[PDB]
Amino acid sequence: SLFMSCCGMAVLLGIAVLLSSNRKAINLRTVGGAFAIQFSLGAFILYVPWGQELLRGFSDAVSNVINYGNDGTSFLFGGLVSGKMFEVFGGGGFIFAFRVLPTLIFFSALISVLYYLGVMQWVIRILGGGLQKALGTSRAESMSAAANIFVGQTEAPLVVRPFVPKMTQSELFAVMCGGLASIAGGVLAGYASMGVKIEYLVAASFMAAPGGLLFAKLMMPETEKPQDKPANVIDAAAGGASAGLQLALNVGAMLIAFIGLIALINGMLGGIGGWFGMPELKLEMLLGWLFAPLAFLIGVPWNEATVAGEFIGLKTVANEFVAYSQFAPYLTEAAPVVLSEKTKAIISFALCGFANLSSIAILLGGLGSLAPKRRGDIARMGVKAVIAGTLSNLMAATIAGFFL
Amino acid sequence: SLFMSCCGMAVLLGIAVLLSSNRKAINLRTVGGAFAIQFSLGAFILYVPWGQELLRGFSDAVSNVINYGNDGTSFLFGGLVSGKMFEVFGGGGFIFAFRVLPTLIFFSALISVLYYLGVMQWVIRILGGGLQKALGTSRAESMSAAANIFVGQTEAPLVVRPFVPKMTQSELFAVMCGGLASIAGGVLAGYASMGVKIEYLVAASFMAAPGGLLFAKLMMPETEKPQDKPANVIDAAAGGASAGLQLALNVGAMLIAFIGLIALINGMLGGIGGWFGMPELKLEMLLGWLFAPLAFLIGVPWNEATVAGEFIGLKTVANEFVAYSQFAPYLTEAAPVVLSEKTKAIISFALCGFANLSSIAILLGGLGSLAPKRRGDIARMGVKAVIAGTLSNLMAATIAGFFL
Amino acid sequence: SLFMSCCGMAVLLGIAVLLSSNRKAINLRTVGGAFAIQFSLGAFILYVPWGQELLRGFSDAVSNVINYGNDGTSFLFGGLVSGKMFEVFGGGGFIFAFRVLPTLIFFSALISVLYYLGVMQWVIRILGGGLQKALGTSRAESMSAAANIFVGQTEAPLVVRPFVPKMTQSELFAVMCGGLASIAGGVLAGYASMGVKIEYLVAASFMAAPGGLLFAKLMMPETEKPQDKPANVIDAAAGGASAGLQLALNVGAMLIAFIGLIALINGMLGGIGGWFGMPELKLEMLLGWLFAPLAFLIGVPWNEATVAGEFIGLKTVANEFVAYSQFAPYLTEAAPVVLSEKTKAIISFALCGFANLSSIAILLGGLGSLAPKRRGDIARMGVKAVIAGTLSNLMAATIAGFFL
Ligand SMILES: CCCCCCCCCCO[C@@H]1O[C@H](CO)[C@@H](O[C@H]2O[C@H](CO)[C@@H](O)[C@H](O)[C@H]2O)[C@H](O)[C@H]1O
Ligand SMILES: CCCCCCCCCCO[C@@H]1O[C@H](CO)[C@@H](O[C@H]2O[C@H](CO)[C@@H](O)[C@H](O)[C@H]2O)[C@H](O)[C@H]1O
Ligand SMILES: CCCCCCCCCCO[C@@H]1O[C@H](CO)[C@@H](O[C@H]2O[C@H](CO)[C@@H](O)[C@H](O)[C@H]2O)[C@H](O)[C@H]1O
Ligand SMILES: Nc1ncnc2c1ncn2[C@@H]1O[C@H](CO)[C@@H](O)[C@H]1O
Ligand SMILES: Nc1ncnc2c1ncn2[C@@H]1O[C@H](CO)[C@@H](O)[C@H]1O
Ligand SMILES: Nc1ncnc2c1ncn2[C@@H]1O[C@H](CO)[C@@H](O)[C@H]1O
Ligand code: NA
Ligand code: NA
Ligand code: NA
């Protein structure tokens, strides 16, 4: 029952200790409180009545903002995003390129506005300040952790960019993990437009801050000693829209290629597998059969562990956007496999993160520009940071499945 | 009657004098002839028979070029830009992204071709030469003023780029105002594809050259002393298409975000206004109530001044493309408010310009690259240039409304 | 009969000799074997039974890869690329922007993957090694020739980029011609999606390697003495998708402008021609009337030489993508002119190449970046390389028409 979930938490913490740079350097106050906060935050917004009301209140607010931004894409693509599309094409009336992608543009512009008004910095300063006073973490890495709740892995350290080139290896690692254990506000609204429950996306985004610090200070404890704009609001909006556009193009081109490549892989595996009496062999079967124990370990039922492993595995070997693209049909009535409500939540939390190998290259570019002489350290701690970011997603998935 | 329009002209000229850098330095020949030319040009193509035939002859020529370029977008988007779209989606069959945006690509390529053939330079040299000999303005700023009739604010000073880094503060200001008081040929054909009368777009584009010089030499008189390529035509076309593409993407992403942001604003104003007994409070009401006297001053009837203020205000606080997007439905039979034919013209002229705060950043980039040590002067005279560019649009709107 | 084709080969070789930099420097072994290989390769895959089975086997493999990549574009554009489009819009249901363009993205990602796995380098090393040992050509130019079978003109010399800045004028010319006589794998799958027979595209791509070396060593013999990475596979795929996206945008914007410009040209020619009693005068008539002898010379029947000249001429004065766009309707049942099966093949081979004036600018950019001090030589030998690349397409078209 609930004993399998508690064991899963110990295992995830166990692997982090086994892969630690120095187990004797682990601060029990830091990693003890970090796990406590992430667990208490999960208990707050997923179990207790008041916490559930605040989460559903914030999610409904986000849901309204998404629909407001949909007035912009309704102007551009007109009837191609109307209700007539379902009367003509049926299920194929939902055009991903016109429905989901423009949401990245609007939200990137919105966050850019909220940054100009100082609204974003005000929230991060509170959340980041509460983390460093409770975990003992440094000022910079705590602000980057709180920033990563809303923005991306390369946009979050911008709030503390003059402290990046001279921060310790443990600090930089935590900064890398803070962005790998979380997502961005843009893609969040995109995933919500695909059918993913906003309550799960918002929850996982907030739990990514202490969870990101947790496995960062576990796999890389602090052994050294730390230290310590657009002209107008319309320019900020226009600048954010351009950034969202460039992101929307890249994501769209990525999904065309990757899904196409997977389709190519499945075609080859159908022939390769046939040589061993398995002509129905596909990528989903491999990822499902390989990630089934990991899914079963975090709280997914035995008869649903294989199906859940297909999505968790795809999120790891590729990225979460490709995984969510194959998990989205499982959130509708036309789902090939009817999953339990708890399982749908666990997959949603275990997929809510930029934790993948391809994000290392992005960290080498964006974060690497903030510290050009630190690109050697980033690439070196790259693989370790992905694991630490992965464990944070699995931990948040185990906690979520525990209180459900 | 016509007395309200003549008073409006005096007020607009009055504000320019009150905001002048030096009223005693104002050249009466320059600003006297500039206003005379803009007024005589308005009287020419909007009142006298022969001038109306030349304007309708040029507009029909432009209209044919647009339809010719529509063969390119008809190939790419096939039936999505066909007549079957209106039989299926009705009014929503008109897809802005496929109908209007590709026009920016084709026209940017066309102008790039006409530049290679020396056709563009030939016309600018004539118009620019006639301005400097009649107003006493310098060679460079007069050519940039004539160039801004056809191309954008950052593309126009390219004809005199070796004279930009060493031109006086009054010259640079006039160059800034020349591009703020006008638009580009690309977006012009785009606005014409939205229902905006081409006769008004072409007229306002030509009146922007003396009008841009008028309020520039009024708010910033000359107190100092002035001075004085693609391999083939296919490469020029291909280069212009790429420039139009990048512009089409930026405009499209801007409209998705801004309209979405306005929709978000209207949602918040509906709650904020409800606290003061005004739950129906929107952005249009504010902009309408605030710009109604300004609209009434330039020649808009009392019962239509508020509605006209919504578009003029939106053009100012944001940009003219967002304003035209909300004014375009008022040019069809499905218009919520039936405006008089004169009012439709006044709004069309008062919106035909890049006069906004966001264009300062564009001037800092494009025009600033032509003179990197002059970015300080551009940002300093930025706000003043927007006002001077705004007054030119209002003046052209007052003149247009006078002869109608 | 077959005598007209053999004469055509002599003429094409004749022009190359007449335009040679030094006819006495022509290596008879090099240009003798190069023509022999291209001719024997044509005889292999177009005449003999076994060679036809290997070509149809490779084409069917490519055809399957295209359909696999179509799963990615089916996810993004949903029902807009479904069969319901033909039930609603009929022939206009085929949306070029959603059907053909995304194929460039997927294939660019695929080739990027095959490069990471060393699969591409393995094939090029074999083909390139077999050319230098049979023709006596240098190591670098032979590898670039073999690479150009699969990738573009600026991507092919990347396999030998440290040898580019110090290669002779004859080597650099052959490198330029290798990319002008061939296409890329991305656009190849795009042309195949337009109805162009894959067997012809694959054949012409392979015949472009010895044909590119043939007319390069004919028009520019060697008179001097020659000499002698992504972190993971997912990063390689993501990087290739981004490159394909940027290419897809440029091609799409080019087709909108060029077709629109041609439509503008046809409008003007209709009036200009009317002054000389030819109101039906268009661009196709000119290109057809002018390239008819050239089409008749390579093996096109007398009554079909004019129609074929329209496509060959358009491929020359513009690019092959614009030509293929106007030739694609002639491959369907709704073709205005029913062409013979041999003629359809000849046009397909004569159009399969980047041989145009606009590709010189691309060579100055991409290839010029590999050798910044050699941009002077590239621009100088630019026009000659286009001709040499053109003759290679015509030669491959004559050979193809000979064995059919
Ligand atoms: C969709 C409808 C929403 C409606 C909302 C209305 C928004 C109004 C924006 C005005 O903001 C100002 O804009 C200036 C122009 O950029 C800035 O000056 C900046 O730029 C000036 C010059 O361009 C300088 O003089 C200043 O020093 C410099 O701060 C200035 O900071 C900023 O406060
Ligand atoms: C859609 C159908 C329309 C059909 C219209 C046909 C257009 C024909 C374009 C030819 O123009 C020439 O192209 C050369 C190639 O770029 C240029 O040479 C330039 O580049 C050469 C080398 O590449 C150099 O040798 C030259 O010095 C240099 O001027 C040259 O100036 C230019 O006159
Ligand atoms: C759609 C489903 C398809 C499923 C296919 C699964 C693909 C698996 C990719 C793994 O490849 C590895 O990834 C590392 C990460 O980038 C590379 O390390 C590189 O980067 C590391 C750090 O980031 C360094 O430690 C290494 O030295 C450096 O080689 C490494 O070379 C590479 O072998
Ligand atoms: N805002 C962002 N910042 C950085 N990388 C991002 C962002 N959004 C998406 N990505 C990248 O795209 C992938 C798929 O969403 C992520 O795993 C990440 O690598
Ligand atoms: N050709 C152009 N050059 C510069 N800015 C442009 C151009 N076209 C549009 N814009 C910008 O986009 C806004 C909306 O059209 C304008 O007010 C201006 O800021
Ligand atoms: N892969 C490529 N590399 C370089 N140029 C290309 C490529 N694909 C297309 N082009 C350019 O676009 C034109 C039309 O396909 C070509 O003639 C060539 O100039
Ligand atoms: Na983040
Ligand atoms: Na202009
Ligand atoms: Na090639």
Enumerate the domain spans of chain B.
Answer: 1-404
Q: How many whole angstroms separate alpha carbon C399 and alpha carbon C348?
A: 12
Within 6 Å (CB) of ligand 1, which residues are found? Answer: A 231-234; B 262, 317-318, 357, 360, 379, 382-383
CA B179 to CA A258: how far, in whole Å? 44
Question: First-to-last CA distance in chain B?
Answer: 11
Cβ <8 Å between A241 and B263: no
Check A88 against C79: CB less than 8 A apart: yes
Q: What is the rounded CA–CA span in Å between residue B202 and residue B208?
A: 10
* Tokens matching residue A283: 């990528």
From A185, A160, A189, select the one nearest A172 (Cα to Cα): A160
* Tokens linked to A28: 């029990």
Contact B260, A238 (CB under 8 A): no
Tally of CB atoms within 10 A around B323: 23
Distance CA B245, CA C258 (A): 13
Other CB atoms within 10 Å distance of the CB of residue C299: 27
For C69, counting Cβ atoms within 10 Å of its Cβ (0-12 exposed, 13-18 middle, 19+ buried), the class is buried
Query: Residue C183: which of C164, C207, C199 has the closest Cα?
Result: C207
Q: Taking a C-beta distance cutoff of 8 angstroms, is the pair A196, A31 a contact?
A: no
CB A383 within 8 A of CB A360: yes
Nearest Cα neighbor of C253 from B246, A267, B100 is B246
Q: Is A320 annotated to bind ligand?
A: yes
**Known binder of ligand: residue B246?**
no
CA atoms within 13 A on the CB side of C379: 13
User: Which of C258, C357, C384 best tests ligand 2's pocket when mutated (most atoms within 8 Å of CB)?
Assistant: C357
Q: What six digits make up the tokens of A92?
A: 């194929």
Q: In angstroms, rounded to a whole number, what is the distance separating the alpha carbons of residues A251 and A358?
A: 13
Q: Is A379 helix (H, G, I), strand (E, B) or coil?
A: helix
Among all bound ligands, the one having the nearest atom to the CA of B284 is 1
Please, are residues C215 and C190 in contact by the beta-carbon 8 Å criterion?
Answer: no
Please report, to the nearest 10 degrees, the dihedral formed by the alpha carbons of residues B72, B78, B79, B81 taken in order. Answer: -30
User: Residue B224, annotated ligand binder?
Assistant: no
Let me know: does B307 contact B271? Beta carbons within 8 Å.
Answer: no
Q: Cα separation of A114 and B312, whole Å?
A: 26
CB A309 within 8 A of CB A295: yes
**Residues 6+ positions from B18 with CB-CB distance below 8 Å:** none
Q: Give the closest residue to A323 by CA, choosing from A298, A289, A356, A297.
A: A356
**Which of B176, B246, B322, B362 is the best mutation target for the ligand 5 pocket, counting ligand atoms within 8 Å of the beta carbon and taking the most?**
B362
CA distance B268 to B318: 18
Instruction: Give phi and psi for B368, each to the nearest 5.
Output: -70, -25
Contacts of C374 (CB under 8 A, 6+ apart): C164, C165, C172, C368
Which DSSP symbol is given to B223?
Answer: -
In the reported structure, the alpha carbon of residue A150 is separated from the centroid of ligand 7 by a whole-number distance in angstroms of 6
- The residue contributing the CA closest to ligand 4 atom 6 is A152
Contact in structure between A190 and A328 (CB atoms under 8 Å): no
Cβ neighbourhood burial of A226 (10 Å; 0-12, 13-18, 19+): middle
Q: Is the dihedral of CA A124, A130, A136, A139 positive or negative?
A: positive
What are phi and psi for residue C362, nearest 5 degrees? -70, -35
Q: What is the DSSP string of B65-76?
A: HHHHHHHHHHHH
- Cα distance between residue A95 and residue A77, in whole Å: 10
Backbone angles phi, psi at B400, to 5 degrees: -60, -40
Nearest residue to C8 (alpha-carbon basis) of C404, C403, C402? C402
C225 φψ region: left (φ > 0), alpha (ψ -120 to 50), beta (else): beta
Residue C113: list chain A partners with CB under 8 A: 261
**Closest C-alpha to A306, from A325, A326, A284:** A284
Chain C touched by B65 (CB under 8 Å): yes
d(CA A86, CA C362): 44
- CB contact A234 to B (< 8 Å): yes
Torsional sign, CA A137, A138, A144, A147 = positive
Asked whether the beta carbons of C128 and C143 are under 8 A apart, the reply is yes
- Distances in whole angstroms, Cα of residue C201 to Cα of each of C106, C324, C367: 18, 12, 24
Dig out the tokens for A297 from the structure: 């370990």
CB C214 within 8 A of CB A231: no
The number of beta carbons lying within 10 Å of the beta carbon of residue C275 is 9
Q: Which residue of C has its CA nearest to A86?
A: C79
**B320 is an annotated ligand-binding site residue:** yes
CB neighbours (10 Å) of residue C293? 12
Cα-Cα-Cα-Cα dihedral of A184, A185, A189, A195, to 10°?
A: 50
DSSP B331: G
Residue B283: helix, strand or coil by DSSP?
A: helix
Q: Whose CA is closest to A146, among A37, A42, A45?
A: A37
User: Is residue A120 within 8 Å of A114, Cβ to Cβ?
Assistant: yes
**C-beta neighbour count of A392 within 10 angstroms:** 33
Cβ–Cβ below 8 Å for B241 and C259: no
SS3 readout for chain C: CCHHHHHHHHHHHHHHHHCCCCHHHCCHHHHHHHHHHHHHHHHHHHCCHHHHHHHHHHHHHHHHHHHHHHHHHHHHCHHHHCCHHHHHCHHHHCCHHHHCHHHHHHHHHHHHHHHHCCHHHHHHHHHHHHHHHHHCCCHHHHHHHHHCCCCCCCCHHHHHCCCCCCCCHHHHHHHHHHHHCCCCHHHHHHHHCCCCCHHHHHHHHHHHHHHHHHHHHHHCCCCCCCCCCCCCHHHHHHHHHHHHHHHHHHHHHHHHHHHHHHHHHHHHHHHHHHHHCCCCCCHHHHHHHHHHHHHHHHCCCHHHHHHHHHHHHHHHHCCHHHHHHHHHHHHCCCCCCCCCHHHHHHHHHHCCCCCCCHHHHHHHHHHHHHCHHHHHHHHHCHHHHHHHHHHHHHHHHHHHHHCC
- Distance, in Å, from the CA atom of A246 to the CA atom of B250, rounded to the nearest integer, reads 10
Rounded Cα gap, residues A11 and A34, in angstroms:
17
Q: In 3-state terms, what secondary structure has residue B86?
A: helix
Helix B320-327 crosses helix B233-272 at what angle (to 10 degrees)? 70
- Among C92, C250, C262, the residue with its CB nearest the CB of B82 is C92
Compute how many other C-beta atoms are within 10 angstroms of the C-beta atom of residue A277: 7
The residue assigned the tokens 């796999």 is: A219
In the numeric block, which tokens belong to residue C264? Answer: 């503008």
Residue B378's nearest CA partner among B145, B174, B214 is B174
Burial of B171 (0-12, 13-18, 19+ CB in 10 A): buried
**Does the beta carbon of C58 lie under 8 angstroms from any beta carbon of chain B?**
no
Q: Which of C56, A50, A238 is nearest to B357 (CA)?
A: A238
DSSP character string of A177-225? HHHHS---HHHHHHHHTTT--HHHHHHHHHHHHHHHHHHHHHHS---S-
Question: Which residue type occupies A227?
Answer: Q
Q: What is the spatial distance between Cα A100 and Cα C76, in angstroms, rounded to a whole number?
A: 9
CA C143 to chain centre: 18
Please name the residue that has the structure tokens 């061993």.
Answer: A276
Distance CA C155, CA C86 (A): 37
Say if the Cβ atoms of A75 and B256 lie within 8 Å.
yes
Burial (Cβ within 10 Å: 0-12, 13-18, ≥19) of residue B368: buried
How far separated are the first and last CA of chain A, in Å rounded? 11
Nearest 5°: CA angle at B185, between B179 and B191?
105
Give the span between the Cα atoms of A76 and B265, in whole angstroms: 19
* Distance in angstroms (rounded) separating the CA atoms of residues A365 and A152: 13
The enclosing H or E element of B311 equals helix B305-317
Size of interface A-B (CB pairs under 8 A): 119
List Cα–Cα distances, B366 to A165, A229, A257, B179, B360, in angstroms.
32, 18, 35, 12, 10
Q: Are the CB atoms for C175 and C167 separated by under 8 Å?
A: yes
Q: Tell me whether C149 touches chain A (CB under 8 Å).
A: no
Residue C402: φ, ψ to 5° = -70, -45
Please give the resolution of this entry in Å, rounded to 1 decimal.
3.1
C184 close to ligand 6 (CB < 6 Angstrom):
yes
Tokens linked to C47: 């005449």
Distant-in-sequence, close-in-space partners of B71: CB < 8 Å, separation ≥ 6: C259, C260, C262, C263
Reduced DSSP (H G I as helix, E B as strand, rest coil) percent helix, strand, coil of chain A, to 5:
75, 0, 25
Q: How far apart are the first and last CA of chain C?
A: 11
In angstroms, rounded to a whole number, what is the distance separating the alpha carbons of residues C399 and C214? Answer: 14
Which of A328, A354, A347 has its CA nearest to residue A187?
Answer: A354
> Alpha carbon of A404 to those of A48, A67, A280, A296, B353: distances in Å?
11, 29, 35, 15, 58
Chain centroid to CA B328: 16
* Residues in contact with C404: Cβ distance below 8 Å, sequence separation at least 6, in sequence order: C46, C341, C342, C345
Interacting residues of C172 by C-beta distance below 8 A, sequence separation 6+ = C164, C371, C374, C377, C378, C381
What are the structure tokens assigned to A66, written together?
């998404």
Contact A253, C105 (CB under 8 A): yes
Q: Tell me the CB-side half-sphere exposure of residue B207, using CA atoms within 13 A.
A: 32
Sign of CA dihedral B180, B182, B187, B190: positive
As to burial, measured by CB atoms within 10 angstroms (0-12 exposed, 13-18 middle, 19+ buried), residue B212 is: buried
What region does C78 belong to: left with phi over 0, alpha with psi -120 to 50, or beta? left
Q: Mutate which of A60, A66, A71, A246 to disrupt the B interface (most B C-beta within 10 Å)?
A: A71
Q: Which method was used?
A: X-ray
Contacts of A108 by beta carbon, 8 Å cutoff, 6+ apart: A185, A186, A240, A241, A243, A244, A247, B257
